Amino acid sequence: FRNYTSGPLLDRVFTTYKLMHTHQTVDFVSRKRIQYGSFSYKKMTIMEAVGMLDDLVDESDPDVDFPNSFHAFQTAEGIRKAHPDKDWFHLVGLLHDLGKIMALWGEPQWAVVGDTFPVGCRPQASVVFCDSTFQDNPDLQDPRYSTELGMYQPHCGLENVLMSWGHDEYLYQMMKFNKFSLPSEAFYMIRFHSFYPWHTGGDYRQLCSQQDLDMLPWVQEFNKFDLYTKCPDLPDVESLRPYYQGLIDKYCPGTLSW
Ligand SMILES: O[C@H]1[C@H](O)[C@@H](O)[C@H](O)[C@@H](O)[C@H]1O
Ligand SMILES: [Fe+3]
Ligand SMILES: [Fe+3]
Ligand SMILES: [O-]
User: What residues bind Fe cation 1, as annotated?
Assistant: First the structure.
């Protein structure tokens, strides 16, 4: 499945989980939201950004030791074959992990990729490596953040929660700034696709609004393709490019701000 008890990749993902749960604090996320929130680093098309990820392997992913750009196409393809009628959703597959361009810009990987969690409240039991990787996090020594709800009001809504910083929130905010013309569902899925304690573990319902609950099956449906299309046998990217460019032209055309 996705194996955190066995695997030939488990040490590197154990390091990045340990480093991520150590340094992802309320302060850190507040800093990074500003650092990236103006989308002033680069100008690029989707396929340019996709190609940039020809240069990136994920250290938090125990299912995968090849360029992450191949996984973009694999996820897109899996979705396209299961949901022929929803082209916007094919594209969400191609797009979802494009926020990882941040690791090519010198961000450490624990600050880019990986299962997300809410920062500013106590980590819940389904956070990977929760029992063993949070003891050097300064926020857990802070009474403002060490309780179940921490800085949050019950059922505030995930859109009102400060998530540990990485690819999902970067891309969510990117797509708003660039005004992608995808459905609300698309933005939501990308923004919370890493939030495994929530969509897979049964955790963080204290923070959920009814709207979040309603979105859960969409993110669970996205997640099964994100996860299970991961395979060493790679797509014919050159073959597929025209199809995806056609969707890019419809939903998020031209040079974009990153
Ligand atoms: O190792 C994976 C990879 O980093 C994904 O892009 C991320 O969304 C997943 O949550 C993580 O588990
Ligand atoms: Fe991801
Ligand atoms: Fe992914
Ligand atoms: O992902």
Answer: 71, 96-97, 226
Number of domains in the chain: 1
Note the resolution in Å, 1 decimal: 2.0
The closest-lying atom of ligand 1 relative to the alpha carbon of residue 71 is: 6
The DSSP 8-state label assigned to residue 153 in this structure reads P
Rounded Cα distance, 206 and 81, in Å = 36
Ligand 3 centre from 76 Cα, in Å?
10
Instruction: Give dist(CA 141, CA 150) in Å, integer.
Output: 12
Pocket of ligand 4 (CB under 6 A): 96-97, 193, 226
- Closest ligand to the CA of 78: 3
Q: Give the DSSP letter of residue 122.
A: P
Q: From the alpha carbon of 60, which atom of ligand 1 is closest?
A: 1
Is the minimum distance from the CB of 193 to ligand 1 under 6 angstroms? Answer: yes
Provide the pairing of β-strand 256-257 with 43-44: antiparallel
